Amino acid sequence: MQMTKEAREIIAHPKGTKESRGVISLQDYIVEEQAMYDWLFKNHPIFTKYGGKTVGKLVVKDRGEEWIEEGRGNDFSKASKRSGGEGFSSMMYRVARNSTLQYPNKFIGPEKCGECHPAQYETWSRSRHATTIRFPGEHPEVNNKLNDPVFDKDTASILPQGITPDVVYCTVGHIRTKFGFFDAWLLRGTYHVEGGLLKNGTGQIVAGGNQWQRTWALNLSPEVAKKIKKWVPDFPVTLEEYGDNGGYVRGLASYAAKYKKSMSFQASTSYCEVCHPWKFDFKNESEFYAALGNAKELQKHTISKGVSCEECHGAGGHLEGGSGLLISNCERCHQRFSYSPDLMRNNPLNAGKPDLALSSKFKSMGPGCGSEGSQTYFTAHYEKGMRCATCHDPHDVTGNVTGEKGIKGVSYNSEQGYLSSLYSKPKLKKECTDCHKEQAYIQSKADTHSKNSCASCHMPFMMSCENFYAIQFQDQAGFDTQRRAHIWKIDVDPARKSLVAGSTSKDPRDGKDWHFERNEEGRNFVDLMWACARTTWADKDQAEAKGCHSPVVSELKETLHFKDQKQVYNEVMGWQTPVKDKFTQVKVGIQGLYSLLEVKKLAPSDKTRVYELIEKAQDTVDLIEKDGSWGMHGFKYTKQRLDAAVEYINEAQRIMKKS
Amino acid sequence: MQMTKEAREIIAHPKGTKESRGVISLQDYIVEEQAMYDWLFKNHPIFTKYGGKTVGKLVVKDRGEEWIEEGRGNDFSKASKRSGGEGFSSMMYRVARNSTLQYPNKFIGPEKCGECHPAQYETWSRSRHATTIRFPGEHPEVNNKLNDPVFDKDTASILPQGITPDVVYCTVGHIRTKFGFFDAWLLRGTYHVEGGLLKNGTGQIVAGGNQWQRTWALNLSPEVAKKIKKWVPDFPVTLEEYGDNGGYVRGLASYAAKYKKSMSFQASTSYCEVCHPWKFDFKNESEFYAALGNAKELQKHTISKGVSCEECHGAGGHLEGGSGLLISNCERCHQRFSYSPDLMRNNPLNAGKPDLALSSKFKSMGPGCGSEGSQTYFTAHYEKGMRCATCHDPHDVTGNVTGEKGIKGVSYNSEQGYLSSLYSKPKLKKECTDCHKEQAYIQSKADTHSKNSCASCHMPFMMSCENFYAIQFQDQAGFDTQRRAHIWKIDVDPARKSLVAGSTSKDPRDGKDWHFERNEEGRNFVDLMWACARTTWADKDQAEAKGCHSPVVSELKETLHFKDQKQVYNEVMGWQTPVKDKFTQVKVGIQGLYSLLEVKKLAPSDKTRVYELIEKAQDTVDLIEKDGSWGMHGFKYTKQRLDAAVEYINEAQRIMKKSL
Amino acid sequence: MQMTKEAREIIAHPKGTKESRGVISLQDYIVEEQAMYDWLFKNHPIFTKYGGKTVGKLVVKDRGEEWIEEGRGNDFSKASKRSGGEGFSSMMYRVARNSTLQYPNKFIGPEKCGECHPAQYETWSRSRHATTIRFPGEHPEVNNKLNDPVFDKDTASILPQGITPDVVYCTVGHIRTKFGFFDAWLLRGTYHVEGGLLKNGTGQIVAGGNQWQRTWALNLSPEVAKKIKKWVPDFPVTLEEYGDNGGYVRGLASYAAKYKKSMSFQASTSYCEVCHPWKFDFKNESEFYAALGNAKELQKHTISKGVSCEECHGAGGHLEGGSGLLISNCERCHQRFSYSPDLMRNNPLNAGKPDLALSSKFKSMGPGCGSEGSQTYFTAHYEKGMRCATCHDPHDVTGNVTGEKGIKGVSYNSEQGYLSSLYSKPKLKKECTDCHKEQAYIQSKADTHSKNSCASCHMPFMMSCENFYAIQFQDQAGFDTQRRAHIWKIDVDPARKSLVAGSTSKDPRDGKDWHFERNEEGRNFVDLMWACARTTWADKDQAEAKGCHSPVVSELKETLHFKDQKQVYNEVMGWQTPVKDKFTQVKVGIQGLYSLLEVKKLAPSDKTRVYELIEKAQDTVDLIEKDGSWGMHGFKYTKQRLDAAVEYINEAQRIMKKS
């Protein structure tokens, strides 16, 4: 057992700044983790109780790999002029302030910020930022039964087999999408126990079957899976067909682990403390390591859980003795840059500019949760100065969502506010209609999609939280679809996809180097299958609008179930072709007449009329060009205006003739 | 004599973070005040020279009550899941950085920021932020006569009877609204001395008669009071009629005190250092306590006065050795939340969300000064991400206001720029017209209110700075009206009021738990009485527009003096009803015609014409809908466009008729 | 040799705050410099090897003069109530954080910020902020030949006579405009050496001939000069006619010096560290003074060069052990206020308000480079809350600019991206057309200037980077024109000038107290000569649009070469006068028809028609009024459109006739 080679090379020859400059920087964080892994190798029960034997190999994954190697950081580093191409690049995972390995820290806890800022405490406290980290006893949404089935009695409990609350420090997550756990040794829970209990050192440690997944447990029954299989012939139906991604019961999937084959061995320090953090109140590291291995002692000494005030604003915020106030830009946890060699090779003028080949973290073939920032970085919105806080309230990030009263589960409790909810409804400072007036105007007119939100087409749930690759069939715009894309640009095309395999991929399902495609303007885009026909169980708008056009969840008539991108493109063109044809005629007419007002004299009263008509026709052209949807924001009204405008041009042309 | 019970409990069982974490938090600030109060109980003249005897009882009011109990902080705390409902909530009064009890501090003074930032120093220095704290010798606007009448010889001086400059550390405030003072022991001036001078230990300490009020001393003469009384029969005229709120001479009211009945005993450290601060340059606390009681010594060692650069930006700003730069969001001094159990009770959807039952500090029955933030918090503006500095320049907060040459006073001096002025004109980055273009366009059409500013209707002076409850008659939108409401939304209703009494109120004027009402969108709103017919002497726009529709100050004909809200509402309906009616006709016509074009056959040029007409009508409807005032921004223009649009629709119907 | 009197006075009676308060402030910076000047008076080669003898007088200029006296700080101070009118005002030059005289510092260098922020590193690293300070060996754009001619073999090399790379700490600047150098003793390069080499202490120190200038070396050949001479009689053609401003070869001018007459003696600490900084990693001031005089040692210990992350964001940024995160408002280096007594005197409503009499730094008769801030301060834009970061990306400040392949040069290499480029194209978040919609609409119509940017008219290159006063003829809008004015408001007048001499000026070219004029709204403005007819070689838009109307560089026909402002004004009237005529005609008509409508009875159909026509004409009027250019944004569309509105009025009249 040892740390990753990358970590060991840095430990052997470190070039941090803590000792030389008195300022901590990337390499210092890599170095400081050595003692934690030494401790775990001697003290974790996998070794003390199970003799280092597991069903599946242990694969150590420390900061050396996560904070340096992920997102092809080493390839990015080589493509950069920084440090002569010999440097390191932390693409996805890193902290801005001290890690949980430094004691003492200056955290005072959110309740103390709340004494003076009760208003923000209240909104923050009813958000998933506040409860992403929770202890046993803090799950009223499952009546505090972490080991009983949540929904149907043949589906999974939140905790895996053999894992009981007394050896769990915390759960991570929510009913919203999924849960994970950390054991009392603060080791990421990538395993379960068969034929025994971790608590007693009995049975066997088995890789995988460690991650509770709401959609698989609740929505994705074998019956639903058979329905998908009619359309997608290789969709897995039985548990065994979920393979390495699955496990022993539906709802508990293998994550950072392949069922019975391999499992990551990872401290919270290496990864999870970047985005689902906690802080302890210990005065020094001796106190910390003494408690390490007892959940109750660690819980009692926990001064901050989850994404609290001070995770965003800094320890002690602006207070005297604190570490200095920050205003988060969200990129610690919501950015997730991933360098793509394929995007780099699109243009020779990219030489020395590898930032132009950044994409987003992908979980196998889907863009990963927490990648909204790397998505928005290649949008017109980001170019125009817009950031997360432009649109989002940074405190009330969950909104007034509630549980599902029609769900009859063995443990599920629908009455616990947002904790019971399958959805998110973040509080917004800006709606699309605030900035896009012409689009709002046309889309407000009574028509096919006028009831739907702008976000319903423009912000599909493309993102994978669970890395449930066994159900990722991305050309069918499903089925591992749990977070919302922040791309906005919709591409209208019969074939071009948003998501593409890397050129290193040797099998269409191996998931190698997937990335977002870039359009002609160098921007990310949403293809029409995602925009119109995606299948998801995370999207409240979709569920309130008859499942949109998904062959799996649509309640529309079968001819409006969109089964491939070309079909969707055909529907779009049914509206766009007639709009563009009339649009062109009108503009052709407007020039036909403007120019021909030099080659003819008219009775002043006819001249007035011709001017008047083409001026009104020009108003319609401008509105439609500015709208830019070519009828997709409202065919009926767009056609009404274009019909009028061609009448104007014909009336004017009739007049010009009589001369 | 002792500190409040709330402070003593926290001192007895403190749960701050200074010792356990090395970070100062709320409870540490409560604890640190113990020494100051012990000192005051032994060393203040009230005790050393007057035997602790005062006319009216002494009421200690330290941070334990001000920073913990105010705004029903304890009820908010019990309504919250935070700390199992057993925590504390500082609703209004707290600091962000060290208080004036820490020595040494890192303040260098605004003149030092000004060495490198001369431009911002200049604009800041000509603002009331810069001069809210002043020493004797810094009042040219009264020819430095703090003890002679400011205006008429029968009205008040700035300092009350028995209080002389040499025992005053500072004055607080301006001619703008009011003044207060702090004695050389840094105790808040809630008293005067009858038959003697404080400096000689003679006479008697008497509660109240301590706050100079411009509006009472200048504008609210017995003559004006009598005029008001014809409308409002209970309105006080004689000095005796102002009761506990008054005192011994028109212009000096009792504030944080009741004349001869009670007076707050309060160090500057408990309350005033939050919003009207100063900082001293002492190396340690021994030096500070040694200077205490000596105005000249304290003044000499004052390194920052009032809302200086570093009060906003932190002590030493971004400089090496400083405390770290801050950009103020203004909530230290301009927010003032107050929790309203009635707003919780009346909306059951707010259960477990005490933040949605937040209101503003009320001074009796009017929202307090410095509550703009708690007001804006419940507006569309704040919801769209707008904050104070969206609209406001943070430095030039007073603007180019001047005195009134027409005022002849015993001491008043009109030539001192903003210091002489009765008004405020903060420099703005954004005007209403920058974001509300349709409203601006219609409003620019010459009519009844074309010379009104947008803020004249939308931002009435509803706020009470002085807590002059004796003249607060909120249903008549007067008469203690010194600061500008930041609410904007105008409600259109015959009876519904912006301001209402709490359910604890047992008498229409007892002033218990008054608060803002919330509309169907969960927002604050301005009722039509405030928007149209309010009475104030702090609103220059109103003074320059014939006093608007106030029965008391309107110069308009008597038929345009609005005596109550139903009368205003009926005037509004007279404009909105015709507009709304015609708007509805035009909108139905447009849609009806569009629908009929889908089936009824017309010659090409008729179809052309019908389309053309309904598109023109649609332009008009879109404009008027987007404006959303239904004629209140420009009645004749609005109805004219709609009358023209009605003509377009009728011609279009004429064409449809021919076919049949 | 000694420090300036202003410095010595402060040193004698210091009222800083470091000792009393523990906080560094302005006067502390002045005092701290004393050791450096003592050291230079004893150790610089000028004294140790040349015996204090120079061709031209040594003029010491320290922080005492730069940070205190510049911009008429003492007059501003006296005009202010601050400190009784007896204090100091640092108008242009000061730092926010420790100077380069304090050791150790907390800088970790931009490559360490880049480890975690690879994206911002990439865009920042290809900007002139990043390379404004460079060491010998880092000039691929002249093939690293600092002593060979850049362009033609009879024009200048970057380094002057007798100055070799081995005794130069760094160069300042780029091909873009100009270069400068610092010797190994960190003295500002205001001299060269005739008859020997500085490294051997041979030859004589000669004042001036020290600043390499791109425009003089490349563009302003004797032929071009002759051409300008035909329009401007006094224009210098021969090297000798450039006088004190010139030197011994075309391309190397005298700056902070007069050729063979005077040269400033200035440490980097007094001035250049404000805006073109660097930082050393020295652990104390002893290590620093020990390396002084050795270019290689200093270079080896340089941890930050130029305007790096930490110069804007503070040393160590937000990192633990750092000095605390900043977000720069750019005023350290781009503001440059200069108090103008003339502006104060010429408006007695500004009495007691010297801030309102602030102008910008002028380099002789042109506004200085890095005065964008003091310029925008008196604009509508600043008043509305706009700041540098409203329009600009703060990282990607240079943009995708490239060299010129057509240039023949002895050393010039045109293939090093932005390093080879003569232009700047800063990345913007907002374009003029984002906020100014009506102007954008009119300007989009195919017409005379429709291909041109808004910035082309509104932001001419008025600013002097080089103080090349020998070619400054401002009434002719030329010819020392290297940076872009940030004023936007164009004044339309036959004679009023943006740039005027101070009342202390005696000769029209003595360059005394020049300043911007203020218009009737208290704002800076651009006169029509600058807007339309200016001569520059720094403006890419101008170069891509036939040199605009410069008599010197225009490729237009000769009737479109504008020689004076009166001629420009007249061309503007050619357009605005017909537009305002028709405009007024329409307003009169609308008002007339409207007044008649209440006393006139019309058939329902006739009335419909008159309202409608009036209403169309009103829309046109509103658009033209909103545009506010009266044809300057597109004469053809504007005039055509007003003509039609006249027709609407005329048709309305024909219907009103039936009364």
Ligand code: HEM
């Ligand atoms: C889309 C590009 C442009 C934008 C957004 C823009 C914007 C503006 C604005 C906002 C004004 C002020 C109008 C007022 O006072 O109400 C203006 C005036 C002016 N612009 Fe432009 N402009 C553009 C292009 C141009 C061009 C190409 C030229 C010259 C060829 C030009 C020359 C002027 C002049 C001379 C004025 C002064 C008008 C007067 O005061 O009479 N502009 N422009």
Ligand SMILES: [Cu+]
């Ligand atoms: Cu996730």
Ligand SMILES: [Cu+]
């Ligand atoms: Cu007040």
Ligand SMILES: [Cu+]
């Ligand atoms: Cu320059």
